[PDB]
Design goal:
The complex is a heterodimer.
Chain A lengths: L20 H8 L4 E3 L1 E3 L4 H12 L3 E4 L3 E6 L2 H47 L1
Helix pairs in contact in A: 2-3
Chain B lengths: L10 E4 L2 E5 L3 E6 L9 E2 L5 E8 L12 E6 L4 E3 L1 H7 L3 E6 L4 E6 L1 H8 L12 E6 L5 E4 L2 E4 L3 E4 L3 E4 L18 E3 L18 E8 L11 H4 L3 E6 L5 E3 L5 E4 L8 E6 L7 H9 L8 E6 L2 H9 L5 E9 L1 H6 L1 E11 L2 E4 L3 E5 L5 E4 L2 E4 L14 E6 L5 E11 L3 E2 L5 E2 L9 E6 L4 E6 L1 H5 L9 E9 L8 E6 L2 E4 L1
Parallel strand pairs in B: 4-14
Antiparallel strand pairs in B: 3-5, 5-10, 6-9, 6-12, 7-10, 8-9, 11-14, 12-13, 15-16, 16-22, 17-21, 17-23, 18-22, 19-22, 20-21, 23-24, 23-25, 26-27, 27-34, 28-33, 28-35, 29-34, 30-31, 32-33, 35-36
The complex binds calcium ion (CA) (2 copies) and magnesium ion (MG) (2 copies).
PDB class: cell adhesion
Keywords: Intramolecular Lock, Complex, cell adhesion
Assembly: dimeric
């Protein structure tokens, strides 16, 4: 009695055993992470604007994906998703502006050309 | 006229974004009443609960195809599969005995909840490991791994709780060993363990209820309700209780209330509650025993246990006269039973001298009994009683008394063996009855050191006034007990 822990217990006298290798490793690695959960924001408006641009004869270049990185909470992700939607919306508007200005310039040009052609006629 | 130049074809750029999320986890540790016990203290056998919690899954996520929690549990923590399953709806539970690891997998149902609206964040649910801690002085640490879609993994914070019985506990500065103590003392409070104890003397056994390590305990109500008892397994073959002299005081010197005392001839005579408590504590008293019981476990717990206030029980027990006739040793042992957990005290041993007066003829020579050295109590009575025929023998009125051993007094004075002691005695004579009692003066006897041996002999001068045989009877009284022959 008392040889296991220094407490002379008459029931449940055994000392706590060694930790498992699994628990030791897991605890030593507390807070560590691997991978992540990808999240998506719809791109359909931006895609349609680029498509419309191509259809109007505008030259369209797709740049590399911008990696916003990784955030630790759903609330940060919702914030960043909102920023992305707003960025897509601005990108789309800018493209659309350019496409409308091109269409107008081309219309104006052909009109002038028609005047000149009628003169040379 | 030349045509105008067409408008320059413009170029536009666009790009997409990538984004990802690492939801956090948090392992909580709670007692059976769902009280947070991280870095605190709970009793051996406490139910300890492990809640494996996960932060919200983010809007815009893909469907979740698996949601898995793996928990390598601590040694000495006994996993309860049925209570765990009951506490963990929405998860399938499995368990590896080899690695003491429980795995929770979200059911299809749970996943469907997570997948119902991918456009909004969703709260998770959590499993709860249920089990019991089984060891004294132990620290139980735990964390877990979450894996989502086999593509995201994270390990949680490490929680812990400790059981009483561990010194140098950085979480619990009052934690130390649970060590009930027993000591035997005489009436003046001198320790008399191992000493000779005369028949009729009192053992003022002192029992310590060691509660200091329980300070700031956070056990659940069911654990506390297992109660608080103290047992004295006394040697009933040698001793009789003086339960009326029991005193119970706390470490601040205050009298204790709410603790009742009973004694039982044996286990079978005891009520069922006591048999159950003793059985569960692994304690089987030998024959008769005394038990001290906290009448109100909650009040006792609040007053002395969670406060870490030791108790002292004085339980006096008298040596039976029969032990002076046989001699012999006796042993006393106690147990404290906290939250149903038993702990044994040290064992205290004493011995009783066989006092053997003798009668001789030279004058009847009445040889007194020997009080051995290293005895436990003051001498206050040492008488010679002689019942003579008087038919028979005729008392002259002359007697003498002598020391038969070297006698040491409390001031270091020694009375050498053979020294006449008659001056320290008186005598009552009944010539009609034919009886004489020679009594040592109490003040003299009490001046004798308790370390000293003591023995004296009387010479009683008899003139024979008849013929035939006259039986003579001599009885020697030492303190509270008579010894013949
Ligand atoms: Ca202690
Ligand atoms: Ca007993
Ligand atoms: Mg115990
Ligand atoms: Mg003893």
């Amino acid at each position: 009695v008392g040889t296991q822990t220094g407490n002379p217990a008459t029931n449940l006298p055994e000392a706590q055993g060694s930790a498992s290798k699994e628990a030791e490793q897991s605890q030593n690695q507390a807070g560590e992470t691997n991978g992540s959960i990808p999240v998506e924001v719809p791109k359909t408006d931006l895609d349609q604007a680029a498509k419309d641009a191509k259809s109007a004869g505008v030259n369209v270049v797709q740049d590399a994906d911008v990696n916003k990185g990784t955030v630790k909470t759903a609330e940060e992700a919702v914030q960043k998703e909102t920023e992305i939607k707003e960025d897509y919306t601005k990108q789309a508007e800018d493209i659309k502006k350019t496409t409308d200005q091109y269409k107008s310039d081309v219309a104006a040009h052909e009109a002038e050309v028609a005047k000149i052609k009628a003169k040379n006629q | 006229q030349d045509l105008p130049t067409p408008p320059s074809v413009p170029t536009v750029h666009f790009h997409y974004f990538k984004l990802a999320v690492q939801p956090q986890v948090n392992k909580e540790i709670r007692n059976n009443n769902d009280i947070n016990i991280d870095r605190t203290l709970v009793a051996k056998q406490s139910v300890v609960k492990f809640q494996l919690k996960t932060a919200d899954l983010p809007a815009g996520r893909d469907e979740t195809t698996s949601f898995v929690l793996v928990d390598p549990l601590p040694s000495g923590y006994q996993f309860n599969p049925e209570a765990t399953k009951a506490a963990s709806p929405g998860f399938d539970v499995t368990y590896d005995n080899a690695t003491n690891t429980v795995t929770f997998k979200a059911t299809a149902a749970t996943l469907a909840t997570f997948n119902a609206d991918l456009t909004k964040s969703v709260a998770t649910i959590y499993p709860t490991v249920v089990g019991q801690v089984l060891n004294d002085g132990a620290t139980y640490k735990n964390n877990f791994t979450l894996t989502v879609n086999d593509a995201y993994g994270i390990k949680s914070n490490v929680v812990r709780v400790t059981t009483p019985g561990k010194p140098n506990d950085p979480d619990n500065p009052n934690n130390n060993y649970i060590k009930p103590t027993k000591v035997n003392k005489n009436e003046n409070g001198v320790v008399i363990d191992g000493k000779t104890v005369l028949a009729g003397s009192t053992n003022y056994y002192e029992l310590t209820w060691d509660l200091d390590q329980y300070k700031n305990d956070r056990s659940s109500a069911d654990t506390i309700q297992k109660g608080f008892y103290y047992v004295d397994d006394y040697p009933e073959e040698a001793l009789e209780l003086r339960q009326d002299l029991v005193k119970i005081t706390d470490a601040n010197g205050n009298e204790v209330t709410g603790v009742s005392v009973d004694n039982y001839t044996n286990l079978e005579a005891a009520p069922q509650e006591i048999r159950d408590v003793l059985s569960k504590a692994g304690i089987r008293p030998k024959g008769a025993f005394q038990i001290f019981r906290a009448d109100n476990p909650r009040e006792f717990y609040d007053t002395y246990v969670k406060t870490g206030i030791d108790l002292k029980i004085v339980s006096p027990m008298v040596v039976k006269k029969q032990m002076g006739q046989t001699g012999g040793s006796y042993e006393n042992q106690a147990y404290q039973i906290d939250f149903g957990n038993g702990y044994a005290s040290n064992i205290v041993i004493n011995n009783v001298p066989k006092i053997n007066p003798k009668k001789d003829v030279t004058n009847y020579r009445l040889i007194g009994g020997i009080i051995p050295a290293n005895h436990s109590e003051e001498l206050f009575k040492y008488n010679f009683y002689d019942d003579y025929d008087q038919t028979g023998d005729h008392y002259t009125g002359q007697y003498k008394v002598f020391a038969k051993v070297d006698i040491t007094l409390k001031n270091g004075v020694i009375i050498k063996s053979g020294t006449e002691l008659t001056q320290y005695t008186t005598a009552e004579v009944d010539t009609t009855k034919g009886a004489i009692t020679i009594k040592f003066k109490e003040a003299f006897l009490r001046s004798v050191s308790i370390d000293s041996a003591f023995q004296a002999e009387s010479y009683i001068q008899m003139k024979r006034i008849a013929v035939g045989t006259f039986e003579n009877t001599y009885i020697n009284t030492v303190n509270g007990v008579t010894y013949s022959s």
